[PDB]
Design a protein around this ligand. Structure first.
Ligand SMILES: COc1ccccc1CNc1ncc(C(=O)NCCCN2CCCC2=O)c(NC2CCCC2)n1
Length: 169
């Protein structure tokens, strides 16, 4: 883990991050569409770097992304792909799933995905063709929705995700 990218947490023994994790942060602010999308580009650059080095993360979520003082985000069952729950299969494609849900957390400013649903009924709930809902006023919903295709080969790579997100400006 001698990785070095500005959207991947350095190994120093971790740096001190003035503004906390992105989850607690987004939660402080609830209790603009333009700052949230920048959050998403960051995590996507971070994730592009890791998967290029064939590092499979396995626990991507807002809680595990960190805001530095400059306010860039760096990357450090409710997030798990169909195939990770059913077959304990973890890949770039399930990491892409998790990002999808992180994209949703951001847009809900830190809501527990599938809030009124138990851990145990998410699978059943996901094979039903059901996904996380488009949050009240959200443009973006389409990209995160691709990230949760049943066929992991239809989920867009982190390079595509970043571009669709960078593009959206
Ligand atoms: C999780 O560990 C890390 C991973 C990657 C880089 C750095 C670290 C650890 N560094 C670090 N530095 C400052 C903090 C830290 O707490 N900073 C103060 C943040 C307080 N908040 C929360 C809402 C707004 C605010 O300013 C921290 N917190 C851990 C992470 C999640 C909960 C507790 N952690």
């Amino acid at each position: 883990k001698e990785f070095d990218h500005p959207h991947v947490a350095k190994l120093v023994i971790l740096p001190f991050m003035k503004h906390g994790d992105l989850h607690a942060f987004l939660l402080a602010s609830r209790i603009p569409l333009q700052t949230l999308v920048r959050f998403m580009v960051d995590i996507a650059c971070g994730m592009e770097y890791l998967s290029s080095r064939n590092f499979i993360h396995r626990d991507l979520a807002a809680r595990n992304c960190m805001l530095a003082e400059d306010m860039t985000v760096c990357v450090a069952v409710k997030w798990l792909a169909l195939e990770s729950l059913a077959d304990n299969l973890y890949t770039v494609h399930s990491d892409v799933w998790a990002f999808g849900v992180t994209m949703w957390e951001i847009m809900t400013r830190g809501q527990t995905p599938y809030a009124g649903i138990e851990n145990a009924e998410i699978y059943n709930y996901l094979i039903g063709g059901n996904r996380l809902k488009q949050p009240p006023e959200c443009m973006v919903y389409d990209l995160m929705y691709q990230c949760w295709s049943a066929d992991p080969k239809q989920r867009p790579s982190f390079t595509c995700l970043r571009m669709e997100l960078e593009n959206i400006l």
